[PDB]
Amino acid sequence: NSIAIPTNFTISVTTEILPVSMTKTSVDCTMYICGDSTECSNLLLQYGSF
Amino acid sequence: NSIAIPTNFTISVTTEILPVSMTKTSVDCTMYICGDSTECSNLLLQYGSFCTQLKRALTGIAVEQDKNTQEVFAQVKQIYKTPPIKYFGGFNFSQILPDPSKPSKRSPIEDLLFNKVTLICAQKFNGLTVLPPLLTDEMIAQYTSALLAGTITSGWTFGAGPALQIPFPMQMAYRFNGIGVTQNVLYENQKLIANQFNSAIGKIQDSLFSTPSALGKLQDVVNHNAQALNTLVKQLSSKFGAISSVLNDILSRLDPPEAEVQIDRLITGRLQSLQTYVTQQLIRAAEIRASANLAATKMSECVLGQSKRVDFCGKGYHLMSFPQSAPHGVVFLHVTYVPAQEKNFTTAPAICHDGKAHFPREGVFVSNGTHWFLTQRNFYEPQIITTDNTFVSGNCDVVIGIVNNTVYDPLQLELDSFKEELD
Amino acid sequence: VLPPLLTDEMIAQYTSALLAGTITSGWTFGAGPALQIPFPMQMAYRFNGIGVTQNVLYENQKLIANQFNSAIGKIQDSLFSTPSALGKLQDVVNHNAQAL
Amino acid sequence: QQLIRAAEIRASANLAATKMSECVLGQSKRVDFCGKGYHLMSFPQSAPHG
Amino acid sequence: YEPQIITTDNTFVSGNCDVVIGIVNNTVYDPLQLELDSFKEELD
Amino acid sequence: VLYQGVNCTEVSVAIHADQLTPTWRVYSTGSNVFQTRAGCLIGAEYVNNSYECDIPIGAGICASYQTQSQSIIAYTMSLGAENSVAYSN
Numbered sequence A: 001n002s003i004a005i006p007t008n009f010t011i012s013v014t015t016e017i018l019p020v021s022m023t024k025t026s027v028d029c030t031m032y033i034c035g036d037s038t039e040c041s042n043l044l045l046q047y048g049s050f
Numbered sequence B: 001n002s003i004a005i006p007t008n009f010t011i012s013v014t015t016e017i018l019p020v021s022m023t024k025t026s027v028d029c030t031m032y033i034c035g036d037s038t039e040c041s042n043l044l045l046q047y048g049s050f051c052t053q054l055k056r057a058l059t060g061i062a063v064e065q066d067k068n069t070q071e072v073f074a075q076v077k078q079i080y081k082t083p084p085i086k087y088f089g090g091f092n093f094s095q096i097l098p099d100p101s102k103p104s105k106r107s108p109i110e111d112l113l114f115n116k117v118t119l120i121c122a123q124k125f126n127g128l129t130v131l132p133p134l135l136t137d138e139m140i141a142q143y144t145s146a147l148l149a150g151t152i153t154s155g156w157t158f159g160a161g162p163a164l165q166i167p168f169p170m171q172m173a174y175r176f177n178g179i180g181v182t183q184n185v186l187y188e189n190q191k192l193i194a195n196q197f198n199s200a201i202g203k204i205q206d207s208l209f210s211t212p213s214a215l216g217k218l219q220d221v222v223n224h225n226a227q228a229l230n231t232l233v234k235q236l237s238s239k240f241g242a243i244s245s246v247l248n249d250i251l252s253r254l255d256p257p258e259a260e261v262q263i264d265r266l267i268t269g270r271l272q273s274l275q276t277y278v279t280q281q282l283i284r285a286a287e288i289r290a291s292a293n294l295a296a297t298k299m300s301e302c303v304l305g306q307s308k309r310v311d312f313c314g315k316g317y318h319l320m321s322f323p324q325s326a327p328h329g330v331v332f333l334h335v336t337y338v339p340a341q342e343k344n345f346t347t348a349p350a351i352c353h354d355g356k357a358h359f360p361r362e363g364v365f366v367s368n369g370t371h372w373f374l375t376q377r378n379f380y381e382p383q384i385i386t387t388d389n390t391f392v393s394g395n396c397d398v399v400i401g402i403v404n405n406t407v408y409d410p411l412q413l414e415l416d417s418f419k420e421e422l423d
Numbered sequence C: 001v002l003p004p005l006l007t008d009e010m011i012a013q014y015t016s017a018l019l020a021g022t023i024t025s026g027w028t029f030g031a032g033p034a035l036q037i038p039f040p041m042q043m044a045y046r047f048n049g050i051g052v053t054q055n056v057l058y059e060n061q062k063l064i065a066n067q068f069n070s071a072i073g074k075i076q077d078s079l080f081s082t083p084s085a086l087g088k089l090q091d092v093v094n095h096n097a098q099a100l
Numbered sequence D: 001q002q003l004i005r006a007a008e009i010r011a012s013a014n015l016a017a018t019k020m021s022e023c024v025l026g027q028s029k030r031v032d033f034c035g036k037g038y039h040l041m042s043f044p045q046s047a048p049h050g
Numbered sequence E: 001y002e003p004q005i006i007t008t009d010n011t012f013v014s015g016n017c018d019v020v021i022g023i024v025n026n027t028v029y030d031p032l033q034l035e036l037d038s039f040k041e042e043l044d
Numbered sequence F: 001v002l003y004q005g006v007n008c009t010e011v012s013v014a015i016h017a018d019q020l021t022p023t024w025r026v027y028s029t030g031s032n033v034f035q036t037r038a039g040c041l042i043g044a045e046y047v048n049n050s051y052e053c054d055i056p057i058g059a060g061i062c063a064s065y066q067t068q069s070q071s072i073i074a075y076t077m078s079l080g081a082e083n084s085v086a087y088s089n
């Protein structure tokens, strides 16, 4: 037969931090691998559409 | 002291489209890489159990896709049927209920959804095959039909246990109480509400018919899997440094010692291509699973009940939802109550009468400039402020912005109309 | 690196719109047209929402406003003084920078 | 790795959007969804990438 | 299931018996009018 | 045994010609060859009675081991019991 009941209250503010987006990157595949070399580019073409 | 209160409302139906499943694929690793060559197969064996891992990853995906479909649609213990006479208070559900005259027994909207999104496929059949779904389109339509019959004939009691029949207008009245609008609003305007509902459904059918991008999410899932397979097949024509992309030509032209080198180059490239394909499929499978889990959550909370989560079941206050089947996914029609035609009234936090502060029990005090009334918050309906509609706590001093107005007490007024003069 | 489609100013404008809507029209904003309501009455409704009667707010309105203002000041001080308060976002930035 | 991180960020963004709708555009009754205690209201603030 | 007598305390009143579709005729009991009778209807 | 993506005619012809790569053969006697959308299922007797799904086959077809002695049977799965709700005004 025992119940506890609040007689006062506190207004509390808390902070929740959530990621929404990433840095958007773009990669030039051919320059990264072959860096402006024609011979490399011609060899790179043999690996298909990677 | 200014509050705006709706004086009218709109019944709105919105469409939410979610992917549930992917095309289920299966890859014969050895044929893809070696294509029936014994020499290649014997070289492939030296790379260990990569084909085994690839097979389990694709099998796991296929199983998950069937799990996703069952989790989204097979949420009902029994298949419910509608009554022979489809009269529900004036609410016309023919657009979302099975059409008995057409094969597959799909509703007009489901048939539209199936026609807009587009079992042996000769293209790509180079060891890459497609497995059928475990549940057929007819079985999914049957689950959708059961869910609709349950919702329409028994409301919210269906999801929690046995289906308990309730007249449809009373189901709506309950739902109106659910959004903080009294039952009499529905009953006084029942014809208006049914007409707005029917109009909104007709608008859904026209919107889906006329908008080429309405179902883009499902077409995108189909396009991504088709593109993934076209890329995987296309990679077979690459040489990867080999003298030729055709394994039979390598074996036809060279002796084993040289063929093994050219073959190993082709094996490395083709095996890497399969691992890339499988990894991308695992990532897509995870994204589809998350979508399917959202669709199942929405099915349980929007269709098998009434949700109070804002924007979870469409924009506006949620009243009810109806599922529809779609290729590789589910489309939900969310029926909501949208406030309309608001008017700006003067308000006060409390009314002061005999020195006591009176607060609304369920509502807000408003004034038209000459008289104070108590109204429900979501629908203007002025009532006389009385001791039955308000509660009393404290003196007319602490509350900021209290205004002076009469609060009527029926019993003291009644005592006067019974024996004030005694004789 | 490609820029975001929405600039920081545009995001701030969306946040500002969301705050103005919540502060001046409460919960009616999300469901449809924004209906103005006095802020203390919005809070009274919200108090009913948590099972506390309206008179609790109206009798203690000054106390509640003071506690709110104190809590917000505490948020500003907490974020200013704690180097790790925003670690989740710094971690996202650090992981992408490290990957590159 | 970027695809995996993108999936994790998408899940976070979906949570943030859900919280925006249920905590800012309404009053939530989900325990600990909108902070500790009984939820009264929430206010969004912008942050870099979140 | 827990049947109660339909009274003016359990229900609320809005409008006339015309607009609502499917309204049925039944007595709604008012305790105070009944009480007023069991106190001084005859005066003496 | 389920032969995936093939017609039962093609499989039966390949069996008679000794063209199949696996060299084991399922008895493949009468009533044990059933065409499904998934493929040709050999070694299970299809019945009209629906049952809850046990071992999935595909495209609505499941198989189970049931007493009818016992054998493996194939069937279209049941989705649930029918319940007609007594809706009324």
Ligand SMILES: *[C@@H]1O[C@H](CO)[C@@H](O[C@@H]2O[C@H](CO)[C@@H](O[C@@H]3O[C@H](CO)[C@@H](O)[C@H](O)[C@@H]3O)[C@H](O)[C@H]2NC(C)=O)[C@H](O)[C@H]1NC(C)=O
Residues within 6 Å of the ligand: B092, B094, B095
């Ligand atoms: C519930 O709504 C449906 C429609 O959503 C009503 O059924 C029939 O619907 C068609 C439109 O789909 C109505 O127009 C017809 O259009 C065709 C178009 O080719 C035309 O050839 C017909 O002459 C006609 O104009 C059709 O009038 C309507 N049927 C009736 C009897 O009005 C359905 O009747 C509605 N149910 C209830 C109980 O009100």
Ligand SMILES: *[C@@H]1O[C@H](CO)[C@@H](O[C@@H]2O[C@H](CO)[C@@H](O[C@@H]3O[C@H](CO)[C@@H](O)[C@H](O)[C@@H]3O)[C@H](O)[C@H]2NC(C)=O)[C@H](O)[C@H]1NC(C)=O
Residues within 6 Å of the ligand: B007, B008, B009, B010, B192, B195, B196
């Ligand atoms: C609350 O809003 C609804 C609409 O959202 C109002 O109902 C609409 O009322 C107008 C009249 O003001 C109706 O237009 C009339 O329709 C008849 C149809 O035969 C036409 O002949 C007339 O020339 C006129 O266009 C409209 O149909 C009706 N809409 C619906 C769906 O029933 C309602 O009156 C508003 N109530 C309040 C209290 O303001």
Ligand SMILES: *[C@@H]1O[C@H](CO)[C@@H](O[C@@H]2O[C@H](CO)[C@@H](O[C@@H]3O[C@H](CO)[C@@H](O)[C@H](O)[C@@H]3O)[C@H](O)[C@H]2NC(C)=O)[C@H](O)[C@H]1NC(C)=O
Residues within 6 Å of the ligand: A007, A008, A009, A010, C063, C066, C067
């Ligand atoms: C319920 O709790 C609140 C606080 O959470 C109590 O309010 C606080 O009451 C104390 C007095 O007991 C105030 O302290 C005094 O402040 C004045 C400011 O000038 C100072 O001069 C005094 O020496 C003393 O420190 C405190 O400021 C006040 N806090 C707030 C935020 O208003 C409230 O009294 C409690 N109520 C009950 C019914 O117990």
Ligand SMILES: *[C@@H]1O[C@H](CO)[C@@H](O[C@@H]2O[C@H](CO)[C@@H](O)[C@H](O)[C@H]2NC(C)=O)[C@H](O)[C@H]1NC(C)=O
Residues within 6 Å of the ligand: B368, B369, B370, B371
């Ligand atoms: C505010 O509302 C009251 C109640 O409807 C209006 O007063 C009534 O007006 C009607 C005519 O529309 C009269 O027949 C009633 O006798 C009036 N009642 C009372 C108690 O005076 C009042 O005019 C409205 N005022 C404004 C400014 O809109």
Ligand SMILES: *[C@@H]1O[C@H](CO)[C@@H](O[C@@H]2O[C@H](CO)[C@@H](O)[C@H](O)[C@H]2NC(C)=O)[C@H](O)[C@H]1NC(C)=O
Residues within 6 Å of the ligand: B352, B402, B403, B404
């Ligand atoms: C509501 O009515 C009360 C009286 O019943 C007003 O209280 C009086 O206010 C004047 C000043 O306006 C004081 O001089 C009197 O002493 C007060 N009398 C009492 C009995 O308290 C009260 O101001 C009125 N409030 C409004 C908002 O008009």
Ligand SMILES: *[C@@H]1O[C@H](CO)[C@@H](O[C@@H]2O[C@H](CO)[C@@H](O)[C@H](O)[C@H]2NC(C)=O)[C@H](O)[C@H]1NC(C)=O
Residues within 6 Å of the ligand: E023, E024, E025
């Ligand atoms: C409920 O009772 C009222 C009378 O108190 C009925 O109203 C009468 O209905 C008849 C036709 O049934 C009419 O000819 C009378 O003119 C009506 N009288 C009044 C005063 O309205 C009403 O029909 C009854 N309703 C039901 C459902 O039995």
Ligand SMILES: *[C@@H]1O[C@H](CO)[C@@H](O)[C@H](O)[C@H]1NC(C)=O
Residues within 6 Å of the ligand: F007, F008, F009, F035, F036
């Ligand atoms: C199998 O082949 C027969 C040849 O007559 C054809 O009628 C039948 O439709 C085919 N079945 C499938 C599933 O392709």
